[PDB]
């Protein structure tokens, strides 16, 4: 097999050669793809450098309080930083702004029982719960901050309670010249008088019948703040510990907005630990055995309602 085996090979080098020029078409193409692929993923890298969007935004407008902010030009209810006159460090609060120009500065809100109000002294002093720009979250602002605002300038502040049963029926209750003292006074609560409101002056005490003294013993004006780890109540046994919350007891209460959150409103003595009522009650509106569905306590300069010319 001279020029026979070799005849099969002197041209068989052009048979397989169709895998050299052909196998450089790929290397030159594949290579190029990557060059641009590198570019593509580079655009991608760019796309994700940013962190997720946090729907909670804060406003750049500060003030002594929400009304002061409302004056500055605030139009929407949201979170803001305020720093009361006597205050040293500012803080975030929830401002409720209506179209009429009123800037309510809210300090307490219940709405789902999502947060536990069985908090100690410090916790009730510094504040707890969560602030949302849509006020769709429950919280307590903190005795200290409340003190600071209701006391700066010493110009008439009015407290407004807003309740709502489990039937979407609401009712207010206002109090003129509202104010809360310093910690040295155990954050005592005082108001001049009960102004309007269709919910009823539960702060004035109520007669539960159990005894004739109930009526006084359930008033809260002039009462000091009380937590399980800090008495100061008129009761000789600690209402706070028993009723489990933070409030201004006076041999207990008639109005109890930091009470246990009972789903559906109606509760019973058996449900309660010590047997006494501890729901979010407001005697002058509903029974001591009906916990509200929602509760809100906001304040605003008194003049903002007693308005004129």
């Amino acid at each position: 097999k001279m020029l026979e085996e070799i005849m099969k090979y002197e041209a068989s080098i052009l048979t397989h050669d169709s895998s050299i020029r052909y196998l450089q078409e790929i290397y030159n193409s594949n290579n190029q793809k990557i060059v641009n692929l590198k570019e593509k993923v580079a655009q991608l890298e760019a796309q994700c450098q940013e962190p997720c969007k946090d729907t909670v935004q804060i406003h750049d407008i500060t003030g002594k309080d929400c009304q002061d902010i409302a004056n500055k030009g605030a139009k929407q209810s949201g979170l803001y930083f305020i720093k009361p006159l006597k205050a040293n460090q500012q803080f975030l609060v929830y401002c409720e702004i209506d179209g009429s120009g009123n800037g309510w500065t809210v300090f307490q809100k219940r709405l789902d029982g999502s947060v536990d109000f069985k908090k100690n002294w410090i916790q009730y002093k510094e504040g707890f719960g969560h602030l949302s720009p849509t006020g769709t979250t429950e919280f307590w602002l903190g005795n200290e901050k409340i003190h600071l605002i209701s006391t700066q300038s010493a110009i008439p502040y009015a407290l407004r309670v807003e309740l709502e049963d489990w039937n979407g029926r609401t009712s207010t209750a206002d109090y003129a010249m509202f104010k809360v003292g310093p910690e040295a006074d155990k954050y005592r609560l005082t108001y001049a008088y009960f102004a309007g409101g269709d919910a009823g002056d539960a702060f004035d005490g109520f007669d539960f019948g159990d005894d004739p003294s109930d009526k006084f013993f359930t008033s809260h004006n002039g009462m000091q703040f009380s937590t399980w780890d800090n008495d100061n109540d008129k009761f000789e046994g600690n209402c706070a510990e028993q009723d489990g919350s933070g409030w201004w007891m006076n041999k207990c209460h008639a109005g109890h907005l930091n009470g246990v959150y009972y789903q559906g409103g109606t509760y019973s003595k058996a449900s309660t630990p010590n047997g006494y009522d501890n729901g979010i009650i407001w005697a002058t509106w509903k029974t001591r055995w009906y916990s509200m569905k929602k509760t809100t306590m906001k304040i605003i300069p008194f003049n903002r309602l007693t308005i004129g010319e």
Partner: peptide, 4 residues
């Protein structure tokens, strides 16, 4: 909450 009146308490005796």
């Amino acid at each position: 909450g009146p308490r005796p």
